[PDB]
DNA sequence: CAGAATCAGCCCCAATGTGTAATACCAGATTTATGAGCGCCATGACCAGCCTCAAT
């Protein structure tokens, strides 16, 4: 739910993008892995107050 | 000329407004909590080539 009124489910997103649900899942997992890769999001890691 | 009436002037009585510096039971109806169940977005496991390199 980023920069929009509401979020969209994975199936509606796949339908809008003409991409299967599993391919959408794999692309999301690749994006999450790339964000978990180091040398990035250092301020995001610093955003924890514990 | 003195009389008292109905109007302004005057006066007594009531009213509000102020007061600082950090019982009993009976019956009939309703609802929240545990009963399971359909159904599913998303977890874990494959599995075909287009996209990305090598030797001659």
Automatic annotation (TrEMBL):
Q: Which residues bind Mg(2+)?
A: 42, 45
Where does it live in the cell? Cytoplasm
Coiled-coil annotated spans: none
Annotated stretches, region: Sigma-70 factor domain-4: 1-37
Domain called RNA polymerase sigma-70: residue spans: 9-35
User: DNA binding happens at which residues?
Assistant: 10-29
Assembly mode: Interacts transiently with the RNA polymerase catalytic core.
Report the protein's function.
Answer: Sigma factors are initiation factors that promote the attachment of RNA polymerase to specific initiation sites and are then released. This sigma factor is the primary sigma factor during exponential growth.
Family membership: Belongs to the sigma-70 factor family. RpoD/SigA subfamily.
Indicate what this protein is called per its UniProt record.
Answer: RNA polymerase sigma factor RpoD
| Species of origin | Escherichia coli
Which gene is this protein's source? rpoD
Which section of the whole protein is represented? 564 to 613 of 613
